[PDB]
Design a protein around this ligand. Structure first.
Ligand SMILES: O=C(O)CCNc1cc(N2CCc3ccccc3CC2)nc(-c2ccccn2)n1
Ligand SMILES: [Mn+2]
Ligand SMILES: [Mn+2]
Ligand SMILES: [Zn+2]
Ligand SMILES: [Zn+2]
Length: 455
């Protein structure tokens, strides 16, 4: 009546043979799971990564969170010990419900969450932990350290489902990427409590994400399939226009809490699940998702990109361009980097990169012809990858340049991508320079190397 729980998302229970290769399994479940945006994965019963930590020696700075529906929160992120946070968290929930913490039904917490975030009179604030793996935090999974690991810990060091290993495996396209994008290859750690929430969002560059709940009380998820993303955005734009005004950078992007029933009322397909300890949740490209924690828990998450994602990654950067949204990295730079490493690429990877590069080259070919007809004649090679990101963004659309850009001596340091030549300055195009990374004659052999590797 008040709150109608969305239908359950798919739950997979792979055999050991299926589970062995994470990328093969994800590709297998993709036709099913991409229709729901999110899915849950229960590992084989004996796949049990050991969790060991001193609750007194793990410190982290908590972030404070107000729980109001449609209220703006920043998309990106005192001092607790893990023990003191746990004691705070446990006391909060038990006091909130006047019940032993482990006796509060998950359906009730869900019901109550959507009540309190909607009620203006309620002024509930909670805290959470969200941080990259550091020497003060550290992954929940076993990692190699100079100290001595137990045989059980060594058993899960090179596991495909050890979230530290996923970004650097052969079937992932971020295996040989150079530029430091710490947010997209390093796992994040999340310490949650009752009602602590993550707002509606999609991952950077429409990448996958995989989440593992190491221990604690469940994490409640809501998911929307990739094909319904723009439908969701139109709904939220009409109800919360503040989230759609342009921002100075990525650190200022706004997100919010919204009842899934509101989305469902506007015919947006929403699915739910309760992620329990020891279970994986996987989010698919452009799959909007949000949720909250049932109680004190500890989760670890990392982004990743498969060969299936590559053409979507290009579409995303194009979408970023239309929105004047900042990139985390240059998609074209990634592609050309992989091309320069063709001989050591996985053969299926090489084949997929080849296809994307062909599109890249033909688009670049047309763009350069266009700007030449605009009067830009002079040109010089430029190593874009050497520039800091904020020193090679298009003035107009904020895209990260790599293949090419336009410069003018009248605006030293300023660049525009080839889509926005008319946005650089007021001086005539013959004063401009085409700054390019590769000639067309450089690019075709690079793509040929990929073709040979793919055979
Ligand atoms: O809660 C979990 O276990 C993970 C939920 N997923 C989150 C959680 C999360 N949090 C950090 C930022 C944030 C923003 C607003 C409210 C709460 C939080 C805490 C969780 N951030 C992100 C994020 C950020 C940037 C790009 C892509 N994803 N994803
Ligand atoms: Mn409220
Ligand atoms: Mn996220
Ligand atoms: Zn000028
Ligand atoms: Zn531009």
């Amino acid at each position: 009546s008040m709150f109608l729980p969305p239908p359950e998302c798919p739950v997979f229970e792979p055999s050991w043979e299926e589970f062995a290769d994470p990328f093969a399994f994800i590709h297998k479940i993709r036709p099913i799971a991409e229709q729901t945006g999110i899915c849950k994965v229960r590992p084989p019963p004996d796949w049990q990564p050991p969790f060991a930590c001193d609750v007194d020696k793990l410190h982290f700075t908590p972030r404070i969170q107000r729980l109001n529906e449609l209220e703006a929160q920043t998309r990106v992120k005192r001092d607790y010990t893990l023990r003191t946070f746990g004691e705070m968290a446990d006391a909060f929930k038990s006091d909130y419900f006047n019940m032993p913490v482990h006796m509060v039904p998950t359906e009730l917490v869900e019901k109550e969450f959507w009540r309190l975030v909607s009620t203006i009179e309620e002024d509930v604030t909670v805290e959470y932990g969200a941080d990259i793996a550091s020497k003060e935090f550290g992954s929940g999974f076993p990692v190699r350290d100079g100290i001595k690991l137990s045989p059980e810990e060594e058993e899960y060091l090179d596991s495909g489902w050890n979230l530290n290993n996923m970004p650097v495996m052969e079937q992932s396209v971020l295996a040989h990427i150079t530029a430091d994008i710490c947010g997209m290859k390093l796992p994040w750690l999340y310490v949650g409590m009752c009602f602590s929430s993550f707002c509606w969002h999609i991952e950077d560059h429409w990448s996958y994400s995989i989440n593992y709940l190491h221990w604690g009380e469940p994490k409640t998820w809501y998911g929307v399939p990739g094909y319904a993303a723009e439908q969701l955005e139109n709904v939220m734009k009409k109800l919360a226009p503040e989230l759609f005004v342009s921002q100075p950078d990525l650190l200022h992007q706004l997100v919010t809490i919204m009842n899934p029933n509101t989305l469902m009322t506007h015919e947006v397909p929403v699915y739910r699940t309760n992620q329990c300890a020891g279970e994986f949740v996987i989010t698919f490209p452009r799959a909007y998702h949000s949720g909250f924690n049932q109680g004190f828990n500890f989760a670890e998450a990392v982004n990743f990109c498969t060969v299936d994602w590559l053409p979507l990654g290009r579409q995303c950067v194009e979408h970023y361009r239309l929105l004047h949204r900042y990139c985390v990295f240059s998609h074209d730079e990634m592609i050309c980097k992989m091309a320069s490493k063709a001989d050591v690429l996985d053969v299926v990877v090489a084949s997929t990169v080849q296809k994307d590069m062909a599109i890249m080259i033909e688009d670049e070919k047309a763009l350069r012809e266009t700007v030449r007809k605009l009067g830009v004649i002079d040109s010089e090679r430029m190593d874009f990858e050497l520039l800091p990101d904020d020193e090679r963004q298009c003035v107009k659309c904020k895209t990260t340049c790599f293949m090419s850009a336009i410069s003018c001596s009248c605006k030293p340091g300023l660049l525009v991508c080839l889509h926005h030549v008319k946005e650089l300055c007021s001086c005539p195009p013959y004063k401009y320079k085409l700054r390019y990374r590769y000639t067309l004659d450089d690019l075709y052999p690079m793509m040929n190397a990929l073709k040979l590797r793919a055979e």
